């Protein structure tokens, strides 16, 4: 909106900054049996049979 | 399975090691009347007449 002033824009941008860093955190800590699942970009194959 | 950790495989491996040793000991410890039966690849005549 064209209504806002400068301070309001800054006060929005900081909250945006927090949520941005949150995703980066979540990608790193999550892990299953010593396997990082959201930071590798490869394929894992089970055996059934 | 593809969801196993590098640590686990040694447990399975050393169990396998123990089992493999058992076969050899049974091979070389069994005997009948002083004749080892599970070695040397021969045949054993019997006089029956």
Contacts of A37 in chain B (CB under 8 A): none
Contacts of A33 in chain B (CB under 8 A): 3, 5
What resolution in angstroms, rounded to 1 decimal? 3.4
Q: How far is A48 from chain B (nearest CA, A)?
A: 8
CB B3 within 8 A of CB A31: no
CB B31 within 8 A of CB B37: yes
Pick from B7, B6, B2: which is nearest to A47 by CA? Answer: B2
Q: Which two tokens stand for residue B48?
A: 């029956």
Count CA atoms closer than 13 A to A14's CA, side-chain side.
5
Phi–psi pair at B28, nearest 5 degrees: -100, 0
Q: Which method was it determined by? A: cryo-EM
CB A46 within 8 A of CB B1: yes
Query: Residue A19: in which H helix or E strand, if any?
Result: helix A6-29
R_g of chain A, CA atoms, integer Å? 20
Q: Which residues contact A35 (CB under 8 A, 6 or more apart)?
A: A44, B3, B5
């Amino acid at each position: 909106t064209g209504s806002n002033s400068a301070s309001d824009l800054q006060s929005i941008q900081d909250e945006i900054k927090q949520r941005l860093e949150e995703i980066n955190r979540v990608s790193e800590q999550t892990q299953f049996n010593g396997v990082k699942v959201l930071a590798k970009d490869t394929k894992m194959n089970i055996q059934v049979g």
